[PDB]
Design a protein around this ligand. Sequence first.
Ligand SMILES: Nc1nc2c(ncn2[C@@H]2O[C@H](COP(=O)(O)OP(=O)(O)O)[C@@H](O)[C@H]2O)c(=O)[nH]1
Ligand SMILES: COc1ccc(CNc2c(-c3ccccc3O)nc3ccc(F)cn23)cc1
Ligand SMILES: [Ca+2]
Ligand SMILES: [Mg+2]
Lengths: 67, 424
Amino acid sequence: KREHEREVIQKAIEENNNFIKMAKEKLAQKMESNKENREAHLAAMLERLQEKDKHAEEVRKNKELKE
Amino acid sequence: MREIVHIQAGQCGNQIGAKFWEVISDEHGIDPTGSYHGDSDLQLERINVYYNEATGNKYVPRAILVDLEPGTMDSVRSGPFGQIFRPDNFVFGQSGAGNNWAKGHYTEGAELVDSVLDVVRKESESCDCLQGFQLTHSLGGGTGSGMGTLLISKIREEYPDRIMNTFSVVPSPKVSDTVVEPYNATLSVHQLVENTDETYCIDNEALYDICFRTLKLTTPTYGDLNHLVSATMSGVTTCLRFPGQLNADLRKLAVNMVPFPRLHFFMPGFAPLTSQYRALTVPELTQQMFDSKNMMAACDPRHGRYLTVAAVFRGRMSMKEVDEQMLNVQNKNSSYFVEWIPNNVKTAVCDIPPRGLKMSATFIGNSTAIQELFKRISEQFTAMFRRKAFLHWYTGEGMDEMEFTEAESNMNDLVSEYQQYQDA
Ligand SMILES: Nc1nc2c(ncn2[C@@H]2O[C@H](COP(=O)(O)OP(=O)(O)O)[C@@H](O)[C@H]2O)c(=O)[nH]1
Ligand SMILES: COc1ccc(CNc2c(-c3ccccc3O)nc3ccc(F)cn23)cc1
Ligand SMILES: [Ca+2]
Ligand SMILES: [Mg+2]
């Protein structure tokens, strides 16, 4: 009975720790997946805008080199 | 064998336990501060069974007060007789047990139990010849139920040869704190079957009905139920607290009442039921104590058979008439007492009546009809357990479903065992 009494409290601690653990890890997982996603969205937006600057360079070099 | 050590656990344990010390302190002429202002020498002759003598001829209850929260135990110290208890024996936690057996037995209570056992050992050591322990508790909450049964298990380990008594308050929907009571009770019954020699089954169902039907209390409080409990506790301890031929002790009671070791659940009864002016004749006491209406456990004794009986008459009365009347109910209802324990009814008389009444009778019965109580709790248990309802409260403190299954099985076995002797 005493050894069983220690197994039960050890289990209660184990599972409480497990919840705290997997919540901690699940959270860090999401925050890191999110930051990579948000940054990937903004990186693509800026890379489409920098692709316009580089098309404006072609149109400004078609007036200067067609005269 | 004289000294008993009393422990009261949880709300109920300490509420009824306070009333017990109020009732018997008046009977032994002890006042709210601890001094003896009596009149009869018979009051002090075995005061040693429940009280220690102190510096200045104060008498101090050999009582340990246990709870996981300080609510109830601050009330006990506030209340009428609180200042009599030894202040070191107040052992309490802070967070309580949330009507959860598991918290009492396995987590919260485990933290506190070793301190209670240090006070138990303190009281146990300064005892000439300890006979045993009595615990007051309910089976329905978490502290008195789970922690209480944890204590019992520990006390048995350290003192395996001493007697263990419980006054165990069984729960009812009619007086109900929470839906998990049947769970808590079934987990505690499993403990009591293994680790006690005697248990007085005080059913709250039966106390509610006595209060409602027979005493005309429309809206009964816990005070009204505990009035009935402390008069029963007074009665079933009379033979230990007074003289004088019956060398009655807890072991003798255990030997004569309990033919099979698991079948030690006693149905108590009291007459007359109160909250009078006309004293009762011995025939009336004898009719009343044996009446179903006067039982402290909600079981019809006609549905079962009496294995053993112990009856205790209080007041000045003819012992000739007491034998005649006690022999009359046996001879006139002989089918209801088992033929295979000859002379299973034993009767005693004590000259001191209780406060209020000129004469009274207390009944102690090991009837097989007690099964009805365990059947009632087994049914409420299954209603919920078949859908595993409310279990998360228990599994969150590390308990497993297998432990509930085990416990359900032990109780149903108990019921089978009582049913075995009803038909023999
Ligand atoms: N007869 C009686 N029953 C009580 C009393 N207090 C609580 N109960 C019952 O005891 C059960 C709840 O247990 P309680 O002692 O409050 O829980 P604990 O403090 O956690 O042990 C329920 O069945 C209540 O109806 C009381 O003073 N008298
Ligand atoms: C078959 O039933 C019994 C036989 C022996 C005993 C031992 N002592 C005892 C008791 C008794 C013992 C301990 C605590 C409270 C008690 O009230 N009450 C009686 C009444 C009559 C009598 F003969 C003995 N009694 C108990 C029951
Ligand atoms: Ca704690
Ligand atoms: Mg309560």
